[PDB]
Amino acid sequence: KIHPGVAMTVVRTDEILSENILFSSRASTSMFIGTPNVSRREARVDAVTF
Amino acid sequence: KIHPGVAMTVVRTDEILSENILFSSRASTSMFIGTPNVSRREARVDAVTF
Numbered sequence: 001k002i003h004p005g006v007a008m009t010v011v012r013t014d015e016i017l018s019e020n021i022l023f024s025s026r027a028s029t030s031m032f033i034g035t036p037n038v039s040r041r042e043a044r045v046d047a048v049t050f
Numbered sequence: 051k052i053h054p055g056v057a058m059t060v061v062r063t064d065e066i067l068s069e070n071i072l073f074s075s076r077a078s079t080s081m082f083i084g085t086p087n088v089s090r091r092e093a094r095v096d097a098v099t100f
Contacts, residue, residue, distance in 0.1 A: 039093040
């Protein structure tokens with residue numbers, strides 16, 4: 001319990017889960033909504049994936 | 051530059067980029083041409099290749 005020649009400086013991060021409030025005024029962004037499209041990704045003989 | 055007792059015959063190949071005139075007579079072959087088939091290969095959601 002004797003002091004060495006140097007002194008340290010601890011640095012740490014503290015993760016904090018926080019409920020936020022998001023605001024955005026009207027007429028903020030314009031959007032284009034496209035029609036959905038379906039296609040087979042992996043045509044397994046047991047079960048077709050879509 | 052003394053001529054030795056043996057004679058030599060050099061042989062070299064010369065590759066030549068030529069042009070060829072092709073002929074055929076009237077009604078040489080008979081092209082049976084069928085109607086082509088169409089197969090959608092890539093069912094991509096951006097542009098489809100047939």
